[PDB]
Write a protein that binds this DNA or RNA. Structure first.
Ligand SMILES: [Ca+2]
Lengths: 96, 96
DNA sequence: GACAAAAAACGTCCCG
DNA sequence: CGGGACGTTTTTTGTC
C-alpha cells in the first residue's frame, strides 16, 4: 500500500536509487560549508571537503542550475532559495 | 511518520535531487510497462517506450540486480518485490 | 553474447 | 577566482 511514513518512502526509493542518501548527504554538506565560508571558490571548497576539484565543480554547477548557489567572480554564495532549502534539510536530515 | 514530514522530505528532494528523481521516474515507468505487458522482451519493450534497445538493456539489468524483474527465455516479468514497489511509490510518483 | 565506437567522467593546466 | 580546454580513463551506446 501507499507509503505511510518517511522510513517507508526512503526504503522504497533506495530500491530505484541505491545511493540516494549518499548524494543527499554530499549535497547537504556542500550547502552547509558554503553557508559557513561564502564567498568560497572551487579549489578551497574541494580541499576543505576532501572531494576532487572536478567532482565538486560538477556538483556546484548543478546546484547553480537549481538556483541554490550563485557563482560569481569572487566565488560562490547561497541564494535565497539555498538558505531556505538548507534550513528545511537541517530538520529533515535528522529523521533520514 | 507524519504526512507533513513526508511532504517536507519530498519537496526538499524535488529541489536538491531532481536529476536523481528523473532516473527514478524512468525506471518506475519501465516497471509499469512490464506490469501491463509481461512477459515482454527488450526489443518489444524498447519500441513500446521511446528508447533504444541498448539503453533499455542497461536499465533492465539494473532492475534485475535489485530483484525487481525476472528475465526468462520468454522475456521479463516483475518479482514480488517489483509489484510491492509499484504499490508503495504509486502516489508520490504522480506528485513529482 | 561479441566487437566497435562514442560519450562521459575526470585530473590538471590555461588565461585574464 | 571562474570559464575554457586538453589529454586520459571509464562507462555507455550502437549494431547484429
Ligand atoms: Ca512474500
Amino acid at each position: 500500500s501507499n507509503a505511510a511514513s518517511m522510513n517507508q518512502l526512503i526504503q522504497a526509493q533506495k530500491k530505484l536509487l541505491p545511493d540516494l542518501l549518499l548524494v543527499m548527504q554530499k549535497r547537504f554538506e556542500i550547502l552547509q560549508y558554503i553557508r559557513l565560508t561564502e564567498p568560497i571558490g572551487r579549489r578551497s571548497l574541494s580541499a576543505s571537503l576532501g572531494i576532487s576539484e572536478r567532482v565538486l565543480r560538477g556538483e556546484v554547477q548543478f546546484l547553480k542550475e537549481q538556483n541554490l548557489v550563485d557563482i560569481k567572480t569572487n566565488g560562490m554564495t547561497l541564494t535565497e532559495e539555498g538558505y531556505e532549502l538548507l534550513s528545511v534539510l537541517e530538520d529533515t536530515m535528522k529523521d533520514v
